Amino acid sequence: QDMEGPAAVHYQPASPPRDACVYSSCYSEENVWKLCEYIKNHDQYPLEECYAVFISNERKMIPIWKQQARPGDGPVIWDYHVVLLHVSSGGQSFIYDLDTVLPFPCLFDTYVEDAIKSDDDIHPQFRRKFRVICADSYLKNFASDRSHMKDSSGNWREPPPPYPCIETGDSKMNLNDFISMDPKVGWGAVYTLSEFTHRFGS
């Protein structure tokens, strides 16, 4: 036996339960934006403690395990995926992924170990990178006209969320600046998996 504060033991979620959250399949960037808006407009936590996390890589092909789209022990290969990270007051980070089969929210270490897994045995060009944007900056700067979700005829590849596109005074479409893992582009900070776990892990 070994003894391991207890703050994480009583952590209260920053979101509604998973089934009560605004959600559209294949629009995780918007599902997370909507979680950020909820946190901002409610009186439980400050957005300063929260981050939007884009996961992708140069080839836009990332495996993520424990995904609802592929029940079982294999991965979903996404072009990108977006989750919300909350750094709780006591220091423990939590991941909010509406698309995971893991708990919602999930302790950071368990999400990284079970949904992300080690990059050590993954072929290097499939390895995961993480663009971390403070949630305030995400709400201030994110814009998507959903044009990436339409074929050349304008037909939707997946049904759109039930509210108008997110726009700012500066832009109507900058989604590629969040998907990109080039630090020369966009907002926040880009991390390798090891850098990401070093920054947020307990």
List, as one string, the DSSP characters of 115-135: II--STTS-GGG--EEEEEEH
Separation CA 144–CA 91 (nearest Å): 32
Give the method of determination: X-ray
Separation CA 51–CA 138 (nearest Å): 8
Delineate the domains of the chain, giving CATH numbers in brackets: 23-140+187-200 (3.10.620.10)
Separation CA 29–CA 138 (nearest Å): 10
Alpha-carbon dihedral sign for residues 191, 58, 112, 21: positive
CA-to-CA separations, 116 to 42, 87, 151, 153, 194, in angstroms, rounded: 30, 18, 30, 35, 12
Residues 6+ apart with CB under 8 A from 106: 94, 95, 96, 97, 100, 115
Resolution (A): 1.5
Separation CA 32–CA 185 (nearest Å): 20
Contact by Cβ (8 Å): 90, 149:
no
Give me 174's structure tokens.
């900058």
